[PDB]
Amino acid sequence: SAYWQWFSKFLGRIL
């Protein structure tokens, strides 16, 4: 349950 945002930590592992 994450929110991809195209980035390092802000994608997949984000949240």
Exposed / middle / buried, residue 5 (Cβ in 10 Å: 0-12, 13-18, 19+): exposed
DSSP state letters, 1-15: -----SSSSSSSS--
Technique used by the depositors: NMR
Tokens of 12: 């997949």
User: Considering only CA atoms, which of 3, 6, 5, 7 is closest in space to residue 15?
Assistant: 3
